[PDB]
Amino acid sequence: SKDTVGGWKSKIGGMKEWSIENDGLYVADAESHKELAKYFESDSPVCVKIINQASKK
Amino acid sequence: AFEENLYCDYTPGAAKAVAGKDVILAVFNAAGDKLLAVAGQQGLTVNRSKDSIEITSKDTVGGWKSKIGGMKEWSIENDGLYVADAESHKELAKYFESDSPVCVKIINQASKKGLFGGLAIVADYSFEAPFDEAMTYSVKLDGMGALVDLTITEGGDQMPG
Amino acid sequence: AFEENLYCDYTPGAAKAVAGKDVILAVFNAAGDKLLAVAGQQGLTVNRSKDSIEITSKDTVGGWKSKIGGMKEWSIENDGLYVADAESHKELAKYFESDSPVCVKIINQASKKGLFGGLAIVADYSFEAPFDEAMTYSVKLDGMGALVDLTITEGGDQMPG
Amino acid sequence: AFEENLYCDYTPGAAKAVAGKDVILAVFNAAGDKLLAVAGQQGLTVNRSKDSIEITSKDTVGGWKSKIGGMKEWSIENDGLYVADAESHKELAKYFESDSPVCVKIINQASKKGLFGGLAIVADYSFEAPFDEAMTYSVKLDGMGALVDLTITEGGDQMPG
Structure with a gap:
């Protein structure tokens, strides 16, 4: 605004959003891909997670 | 160093270059009592x-348009290796989760001098996990206000401890 | 260089090529008494x-649209190695902070001639510090107006020192 | 800044432009001893x-209508970010509620010279609050009688504070 001084604009934080992208080899008979296809067809939300399989965290 | 430096000179007048590994980004914790170097920056x-x-008008002569200065802003992008157990990364996650404007500063490790410092918000915090190499992180912070330049300003030389 | 120079022509007719080593950007300080080149230009x-x-109308014939000249603008981009303790970089930082217009010029340090000069604003002042190589800097200057051409106008041969 | 100002000119003769951010609308508080700038104007x-x-008549010749000057009026519209606890906004709220004239003045804080002054009424005082941006206010003041143009008279150079 016209009240700010110092020559630098003022900003504040806003909303938040997130997304996950994953690419790899496709196995149509895999149960994971079958579940993903069922979720895509039925448009139901999917509970998803990212884990560290080595550090067990 | 001798033979009157006929072939090789040793006089320090400047460095002529600053190694990028000697310039790092540091953050202030929730209370700000400690300065933390971000883990595994690259x-x-x-x-x-x-x-x-642009302020060009019909009174402008000479055939060149007229411009003046205006508002200014800043941002910092830092990428590198990510370890979830690093204290700096935990503080960054805490800052991201709960708004919490953060105080960061760019410093020179070797020269023992601070370069820049200011308040910013964690605009972007992303990770990538390719299967052929290690997991990497990227962070982008936008400035809320003035970014104080410590090179031409006296003071601002605290270091991580 | 003899026997009528049947294979070795040494007659200087024109340079025919100007190496980038000789084209130097320089700026005037706050007082303007001393002009200095920016350290580590690359x-x-x-x-x-x-x-x-465009001035095309139904009166024009031949099937080609009609155009005329318009306004003018100019800018300068300069990248290189950043030395925070250099006087030129300190002056640039002071100009950027104090938003005052800066007098800049492009000269030929080898041919002992000047090329361009004028007033500008520091629209951008950014730095990069990769961990592999030295930390760098990039500057962009936008013209306030006329950028005079010293290659067709006499004078403008002052140089740093 | 030198070389006889061959290319970069620094002679102060005028401004040729005035930044909008340097123009401030201010109001006198209910007591009047303090001049307060409205908080967060944009x-x-x-x-x-x-x-x-129009005074056209049958004796008017030349095929052109004849007119004369009439009455005068003025209004001031301001807009910006709204904070309830701000002193200026509180004063505006009391002025709107009490239904009393407000002493307003428009000044150029860059040159420390007043531009306009007058007595107004708070005709409109509205607010907006979308869920993506910050809450904003807009005020419109109609004129009570004359509006003194401070640019063509002495005095009226009291900055807010």
């Missing part, structure tokens, strides 16, 4: 830009 | 552009 | 209009 970019306002 | 580009105004 | 326009009375 790259750092500091952007500062100023808007230009 | 690359320089100068952009000068004009506008085209 | 836009401001001044309207001044004069009516025209």
Whole structure:
């Protein structure tokens, strides 16, 4: 605004959003891909997670 | 160093270059009592830009349009290796989760001098996990206000401890 | 260089090529008494552009649209190695903070001639610090107006020192 | 800044432009001893209009209508970010509620020179609050009688504070 001084604009934080992208080899008979296809067809939300399989965290 | 430095000179007048590994980004914790170096940084970019306002009019002569300075802003992008157990990364996650404007500063480790410092918000915090190499992180912070330049300002030389 | 120079022509007719080592950007300090070159210059580009105004109408014939000249603008981009303790970089930082216009010029340090000069604003002042190589800097200057051409106008041969 | 100002000119003769951020609308508090700038202004326009009375008659020649000047009026519209606890906004709220004239003045804080002054009424005082941006206010003040143009008279150079 016209009240700010110092020559630098003022900003504040806003909303938040997130997304996950994953690419790899496709196995149509895999149960994971079958579940993903069922979720895509039925448009139901999917509970998803990212884990560290080595550090067990 | 001798033979009157006929072939090789040792006089320190400047460095003529600063190694990128000697310039790092440091953050202040929730209370700010400690300075934390971000774990496993590999790259750092500091952007500062100023808007230009065109004031050309029919009174302008010489065939060249007229411009003046305007508002200015800044942002910092830092990428590198990510370890979830690092204290600096935990503080960054805490800052991201709960708004919490953060105080960061760009410093020179070897020269023992601070370069820049200011308040910013964690605009972007992303990770990538390719299967052929290690997991990497990227972070982008936008400036809420003035980015104090410590090179031409006396003071600002605290280091991580 | 003899026997009528049947294979070795040494007659200087024209340079026919100007190496980038000799084209130097320089700026005037706050007082303007001493002009100094920017430390660690590595690359320089100068952009000068004009506008085209369309004046095509139903009167025009031949199937080709009609255009005329317009306004003018210019900018300078310079990238290189950043030395925070250099006087030129300190002056640039002071100009950027204090938003005062800066007098800049492009000269030929080898041919002992000047090329360009004028007033500008520091629209951008950014730095990059990769961990592999030395930390760098990039500066963009936008013209306030006329960028005089010293290659067609006499004078303008002052140089740093 | 030197070389006889061959290319970069620094002679102060005028401004040729005035930044909008340097123009401030301010109001006198209920007591009047303090001049307060309205908090968080972002836009401001001044309207001044004069009516025209047509006096065309059968003895008018030349095939052109004849008019004369008429009455005058003015209005000021301001807009910006709204904070309830701000002193200026509190004063505006009391002025709107009490239904009393407000002493307003428009100044150029860059040159420390007043531009306009007058007595107004708070005709409109509205607020907006979208869920993506910050809450904003817009005020419109109609003119009570004359509006003194401070640019063509002495005095009226009291900055807020």
